[PDB]
Design an enzyme around this catalytic site. Sequence first.
Site, short mmCIF file in Angstrom:
data_model
loop_
_atom_site.label_atom_id
_atom_site.label_comp_id
_atom_site.label_asym_id
_atom_site.label_seq_id
_atom_site.Cartn_x
_atom_site.Cartn_y
_atom_site.Cartn_z
CG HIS A 237 -1.72 -1.18 1.47
ND1 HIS A 237 -2.72 -1.58 0.62
CD2 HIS A 237 -1.68 -2.11 2.46
CE1 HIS A 237 -3.28 -2.69 1.07
NE2 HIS A 237 -2.65 -3.04 2.18
CG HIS B 31 2.87 5.83 6.00
ND1 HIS B 31 2.61 5.76 7.35
CD2 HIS B 31 1.80 6.45 5.45
CE1 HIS B 31 1.41 6.27 7.59
NE2 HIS B 31 0.90 6.72 6.46
CG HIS C 168 -0.84 8.64 2.13
ND1 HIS C 168 -1.68 7.56 2.15
CD2 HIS C 168 -0.45 8.82 3.41
CE1 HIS C 168 -1.79 7.09 3.38
NE2 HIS C 168 -1.04 7.84 4.17
CD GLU D 186 -4.06 9.65 3.02
OE1 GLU D 186 -3.74 9.57 4.22
OE2 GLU D 186 -4.67 8.73 2.42
CG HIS E 59 0.44 10.44 7.18
ND1 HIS E 59 -0.59 9.75 6.56
CD2 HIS E 59 0.17 11.75 7.02
CE1 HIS E 59 -1.43 10.63 6.03
NE2 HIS E 59 -1.00 11.85 6.31
CB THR F 54 -5.98 8.10 5.92
OG1 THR F 54 -4.67 7.59 5.70
CG2 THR F 54 -5.96 9.39 6.74
CB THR F 55 -5.29 2.64 5.17
OG1 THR F 55 -4.71 2.02 6.32
CG2 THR F 55 -4.31 3.57 4.54
#
EC number: 4.2.1.1
Length: 257
Positions: free
Chosen positions: A61, A91, A93, A103, A116, A195-196
């Site tokens: 992911h 990590h 995004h 995000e 994040h 958020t996941t």
Amino acid sequence: HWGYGKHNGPEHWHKDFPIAKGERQSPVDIDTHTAKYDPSLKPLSVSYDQATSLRILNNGHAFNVEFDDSQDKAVLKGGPLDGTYRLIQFHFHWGSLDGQGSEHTVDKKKYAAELHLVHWNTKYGDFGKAVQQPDGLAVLGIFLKVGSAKPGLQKVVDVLDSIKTKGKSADFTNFDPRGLLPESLDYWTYPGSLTTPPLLECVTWIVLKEPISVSSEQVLKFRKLNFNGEGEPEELMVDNWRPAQPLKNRQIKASFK
Ligand SMILES: NS(=O)(=O)c1cc(F)ccc1F
Ligand SMILES: NS(=O)(=O)c1cc(F)ccc1F
Ligand SMILES: OC[C@H]1O[C@@H](O)[C@H](O)[C@@H](O)[C@@H]1O
Ligand SMILES: OC[C@H]1O[C@@H](O)[C@H](O)[C@@H](O)[C@@H]1O
Ligand SMILES: OC[C@H]1O[C@H](O)[C@H](O)[C@@H](O)[C@@H]1O
Ligand SMILES: [Zn+2]
């Protein structure tokens, strides 16, 4: 099972994670005009001098840079936070193109990526217990825009060729996350969620106002990662962001006047 594609992405997650339609979901759009200075916020303390990075993992992911959280080394305190929050991983995004990838959004503007730094509240002992608590986690979010290179990111970029596919990891010791911060710690804060999936509503979000600049070449290397495992058809790891969710009964507070 879940992912980011047309058939398993954010619009499908609610079927297996009904909290996806909950009352404090993340990310959100940050309306900077409606956000209000909060004089009750204490000074924010990002204390990463003794951080111990261990490993970098492609989890299918994103990629996680993992830290030793077996004692207070890298911690986040102050600001909206009651207590000490230990850094466990960071990590990103990011998008398929520079015009999307973050995000959170700022007055609806999407950044190229978002970092994040994930921390758990030590009064709950372990991350797993922390994600059963309303104040279990604190995530420090930092926007990335494309411009000049970020020197402190280059070690991350240069290892990605060794973790191209899901399930691959590599040693990643002696990495200093202080090199990923901007100059200013001005921030917005609100209560939200992961958020996941599993989308748990445990997070105090602290989103820095100042983006960091990274070079086009740096983010292009993020986009060479793969969602798939080794030997499987190549699916570029891009657009691994959830869109903004309804603010509901929340207010975004600002650390700055
Ligand atoms: N709710 S979900 O995104 O986890 C999901 C998983 C699948 F395996 C298939 C379809 C889905 F929608
Ligand atoms: N993107 S996030 O920082 O909300 C997050 C952190 C985790 F540790 C697990 C799941 C997540 F979605
Ligand atoms: O090696 C990365 C970082 O690790 C930390 O534990 C050290 O205290 C720092 O001086 C160093 O920059
Ligand atoms: O009732 C007045 C209060 O309303 C709240 O919604 C705001 O967060 C406070 O800043 C304000 O003082
Ligand atoms: O600091 C993170 C990593 O940066 C570079 O890849 C170094 O070669 C490696 O030894 C280190 O683990
Ligand atoms: Zn994240």
